[PDB]
Design a protein around this ligand. Sequence first.
Ligand SMILES: Nc1ncnc2c1ncn2[C@@H]1O[C@H](COP(=O)(O)OP(=O)(O)O)[C@@H](O)[C@H]1O
Ligand SMILES: Nc1ncnc2c1ncn2[C@@H]1O[C@H](COP(=O)(O)OP(=O)(O)O)[C@@H](O)[C@H]1O
Lengths: 760, 777
Amino acid sequence: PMMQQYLRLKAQHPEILLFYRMGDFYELFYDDAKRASQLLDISLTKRGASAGEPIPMAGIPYHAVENYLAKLVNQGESVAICEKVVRIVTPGTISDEALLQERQDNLLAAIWQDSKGFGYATLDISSGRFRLSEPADRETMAAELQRTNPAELLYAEDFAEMSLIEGRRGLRRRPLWEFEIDTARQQLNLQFGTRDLVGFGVENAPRGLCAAGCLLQYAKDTQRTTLPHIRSITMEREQDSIIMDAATRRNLEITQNLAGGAENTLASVLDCTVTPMGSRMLKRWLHMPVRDTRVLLERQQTIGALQDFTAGLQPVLRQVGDLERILARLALRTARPRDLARMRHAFQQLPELRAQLETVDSAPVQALREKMGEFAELRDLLERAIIDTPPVLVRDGGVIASGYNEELDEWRALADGATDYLERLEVRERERTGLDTLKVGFNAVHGYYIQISRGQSHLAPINYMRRQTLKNAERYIIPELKEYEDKVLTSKGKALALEKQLYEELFDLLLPHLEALQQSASALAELDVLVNLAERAYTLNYTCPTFIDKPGIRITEGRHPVVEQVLNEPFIANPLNLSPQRRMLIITGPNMGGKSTYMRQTALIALMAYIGSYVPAQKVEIGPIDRIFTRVSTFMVEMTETANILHNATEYSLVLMDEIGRGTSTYDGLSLAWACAENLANKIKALTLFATHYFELTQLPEKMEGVANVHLDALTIAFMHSVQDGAASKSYGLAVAALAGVPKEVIKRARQKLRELESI
Amino acid sequence: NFDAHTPMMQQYLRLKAQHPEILLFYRMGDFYELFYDDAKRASQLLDISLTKRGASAGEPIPMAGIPYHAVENYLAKLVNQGESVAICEGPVERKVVRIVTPGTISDEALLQERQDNLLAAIWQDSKGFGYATLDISSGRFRLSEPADRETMAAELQRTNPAELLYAEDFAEMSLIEGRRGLRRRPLWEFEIDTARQQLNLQFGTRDLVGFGVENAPRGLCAAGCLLQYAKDTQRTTLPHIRSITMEREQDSIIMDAATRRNLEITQNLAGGAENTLASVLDCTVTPMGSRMLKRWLHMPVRDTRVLLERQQTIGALQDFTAGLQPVLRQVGDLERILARLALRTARPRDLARMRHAFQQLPELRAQLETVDSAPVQALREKMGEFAELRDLLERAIIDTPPVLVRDGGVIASGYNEELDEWRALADGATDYLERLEVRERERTGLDTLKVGFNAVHGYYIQISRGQSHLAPINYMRRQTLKNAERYIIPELKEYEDKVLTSKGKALALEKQLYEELFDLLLPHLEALQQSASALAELDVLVNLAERAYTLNYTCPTFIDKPGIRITEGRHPVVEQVLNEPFIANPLNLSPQRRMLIITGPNMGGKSTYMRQTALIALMAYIGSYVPAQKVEIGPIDRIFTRVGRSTFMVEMTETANILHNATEYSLVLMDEIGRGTSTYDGLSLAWACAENLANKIKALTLFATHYFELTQLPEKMEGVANVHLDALEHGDTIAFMHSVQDGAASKSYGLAVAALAGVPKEVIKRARQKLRELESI
Ligand SMILES: Nc1ncnc2c1ncn2[C@@H]1O[C@H](COP(=O)(O)OP(=O)(O)O)[C@@H](O)[C@H]1O
Ligand SMILES: Nc1ncnc2c1ncn2[C@@H]1O[C@H](COP(=O)(O)OP(=O)(O)O)[C@@H](O)[C@H]1O
């Protein structure tokens, strides 16, 4: 009967480690101890046993286990905690603030492999944000697993390309019944309360519904709740956003710099959001730029309309905090008293924001104002039910405010030491009995009593039950008074238990508003983003981009939004004109000329325009952009990226290609660079910026339509960082080499070779 | 308003005034508290709850707490953030006991087992640089006087300190800018005679002539500042630091930062430890052994005699790897344990592990006893025995001691007559007072009656406020705001004294006898540290003896003129990471064959071949056996790797470093110089650089190019020759032979490789057409 209370629910998911209650020290057994002690080096022990075969043990002490949660969970392992197992922690299902990262989303994902493609579904437990997609090929699944980057990945038993999910943290093998399409529909439809999955536009996508269905059960089974925050699933269409492979996200340093850090990136410049849920939304937008023109226009309107009012809106938005992750704990019933105190504090800012946005003459602003609600009755409820600054946990007490419930206020008075009933009883009894010496008292000896002095004692009524005889007086008890003592002795207990019950009641009172509450969390997150982008555009001097109906980019005095911030010396803004009549530019000129910076700034201004933000330029006109491609074992990996561009670019794609042809012979390289420039020019007809050192490619504009020459000017070598019309005058390879420090005689002799080379 | 703060808040504010830029953890028995801006800074970096509690200077106090059992867990995060943390232990007796800093970490839970952790000090004079590093947990103290900015830059990259002490005056800020745990220190700490006085005194010498540093003031200045910093953080003596060691350039193979990264010595190009030379060679069984090898790898010795003894050891121990390794494992990191003995910070289990390490010494001595080799019998001698200290620890501590001495119960019974008697009168102390709480609460039943201990009160009993009425009269109230009222029992306050005094005797005496173990061990520290040094090296050589066995390695041969004569040589990392066999290759370099022009296809093996040459050189120059059938290696002053700002700019800067500092004793590896510029300007540079290293520098050069025009250099020069990598075409697909043959590359395979990478057939069909057209003109 000892061991039979921990394996009760472990039989369902056997990979889960269990911190068992044993001698006020969280322990483990049956090879769970082997890992706990394997990747942590902690004390491997044995427990007393005489059944004929040995018992394995490995432990840790109480209030010295929270640091072992985050370590094992960030490692990729799951942890259950027996007390009853009142907590299961899995890498993709963490709802607690301490384990999560404030400005990074955390995902649970499930992958599937059908006889016509894959099934991929993702969920954030702390948002309720549920997505699904149908990648038909390995290369797209690779790009999806790299972008979503789940902390916990569910895969079927029969999964075929386990190479895609090899060497991954938080991996989970699952039986085929979890993925069954018929039951997945039943599960999902009922989770969203629907007859068909149309309206979410996922009904006709069965590969992804399997992965959705498996995941939904794995979330329910580990979080043991209704999961009310998960009310919808959404397919992400490629046409709906700007496609970018993992290479482009890396070369454009969107949220991560080339060295792994976060410093000196597009997000480090634009992300000045005042809430964690805002920061998270902004980073999401940067990685998924929208192709919807109206969403983008409503986004610019909010930026322009709220620019003057940032100073008043941001300190208020700061006070809202991460309502999103607070509501997730309300949905999972895990919400601590401080979560509810902070939710009230967020609610106390909605009148301010509503009053502030009231006169803003903008339909999308007025739309955010409505969506963010006010929740007048819910604010009042939390003001009345919780104390101003409550404790971290419920159990000790002191959470429920005085005045919310009279029985609590009553119970608390007996626990504090209120003697009002005793004063009332005393007057009643004295007047009732007509004995002036009658007094109500208490001693450890006989408890609560009615004392009558010897001289009146013999006239004590027949209902008085004597307990003590002193020389001066006698002391009695009555049913009424016995009943009061019992209440006084159970006071703290009853009050502590009632607090707990009234605390639960609040969840019941709050949850039927979760939908409206989730829209408010979203409205306020988004508000913080566009108010951030409003302030950024003013401070970092940005203009509103213009949308045109054909492939093309027209940038006037454009800048690199990160380089301009990093540099001490001023940024030299440059123009660009890409149109259906001028599609490809052969960018020539010296090293440190500004070729890379010019190409990347084009991709970032394009990206920013496609997040609804104002851009770093005097003026921008941009057409549809379906994809941003950068090509900016060396030759082999450059050609792999090149083949990706040639196989997937369209007339709506932006192609940035730097020095293609390097890493091979001059002839082979030139041949290859020419072939590629030719293909992207006359066959693909993408918006190409093609940086080269082969001055032979400068003959292409003379040879074909849509191609033209530009160069980075350099002046005895001074880099001017200005893009000019025409092919570059000469080669500064020897001058740059001289500046890098290459010996005089080495440069002098290389100049002699140069004479001989151009003299043949 | 200082005067408006509470008696202990003023004390905190007085202690926080001592070091205004470091977080002060203030002990409050159970917890470590941080206040105000410190509490705000610790709530964010440690992700702990911040609560505005109490009152001080007319306002609530922003507070943040840390449990005592979890202090090490939280300290570990701060030191990983490059942060220093002061530890604090009307009122009386509260001072900063220790100053936890990234470069002075001596505790196991805060250090990486297989990684070295250094505190450094940098100096800049009108005549040059002065550098000094200390590993506090071994006593390893080194100093150098760099000249080049490049020399200083590679030294900082090689040592990569956890903490960098730079003077106020320091000029080239760009050298150390934005690094981890930088510590700007006043110019006086770096004073020459003060540095000489403090260093000589520290090693008990007349002058510093015997360390070879007496003549190096730039280095001595940085070493001096550093020494007083280490002294001031620890707040006690450093007996383990008894020598300073000059690091000259002629002693080791010079490797600039770019070369260390390109050869993936200990860290690969992605930052990971996976697929490194260290990852293949480091199978040592003790942490001290892992760190020594990592050290050896980064600083290959140039001393012929040292290298010969290392090969000798490896050769003589090859057959005893299986016998010595399990015993050597038992020794553990005695080196780090010994430094914790020096700082008197060694916990009971550090002494347990010390006693277990001692138990292995006669066995390791037994095995090595008949090994017929001078460096082996030398390592055997240095290893020591310490039967005297083994018996002492065996008598003083129990089989498995607890983590702390705070609660006590570690000094084994029968070791002290006074302690045995005092503990017997302490076993009946946690008997009667425990049995008291049950019988009293059974006699007067209350749902909330708890017992609490205080330093000034003794033992208190606390009950509910409503329940307080029914509290006994044989109880004496000492009421407080929290909870209800907490009383003391006069009936049993005489027994309270007799128990807390008895426990207070047997615990203060236990700590007295334990403090005495340090006093009994410390006069042997030098001999113990020599023993830890031998045991770590024996681990490194037995490891290298095992690797040479398993990975099939041969002993390299040392020649007198520059040269590398490799027979059936292989890349030690690539051969392990591959499923298919590695095609072994021959290299031949000499004064009459200084430079090779490596021609051949892409993905052919040009890059791997060049990198295997440097690795075989390094491996030979650490004393190891090499991945080859035979190797003859001449002296190597420096290894330069230009293999794999702008792409062109960094390549040109690396080239500039090679041309300016490479000599006839240098091994220079260069992969396609001239890329990132025009075909003519590129060719002009590649030709010029090759012509300079062949004719003027005369370095041992491996020069891989796609400029087939350079295959003409052997026709026009001495000591220059052609080599190529072969491949075969199957009409369409190409199979790479990975074999180094003499002569130039027959053809260029760019179009074939680009088609292998998936470039559209039509695009290759057009690339061929342009090519046909180009080959004709
Ligand atoms: N327009 C500009 N204004 C100011 N500084 C610039 C500009 N463009 C580039 N720079 C600076 O000079 C460097 C030039 O390098 P880069 O653009 O990478 O040239 P390339 O690819 O031709 O070698 C940049 O990293 C940046 O520091
Ligand atoms: N001798 C060898 N035996 C087996 N594989 C080899 C050998 N030399 C190189 N390789 C493999 O060939 C591939 C390409 O080698 P590499 O040196 O990078 O080519 P390149 O000639 O372009 O510089 C790598 O995967 C490497 O592991």
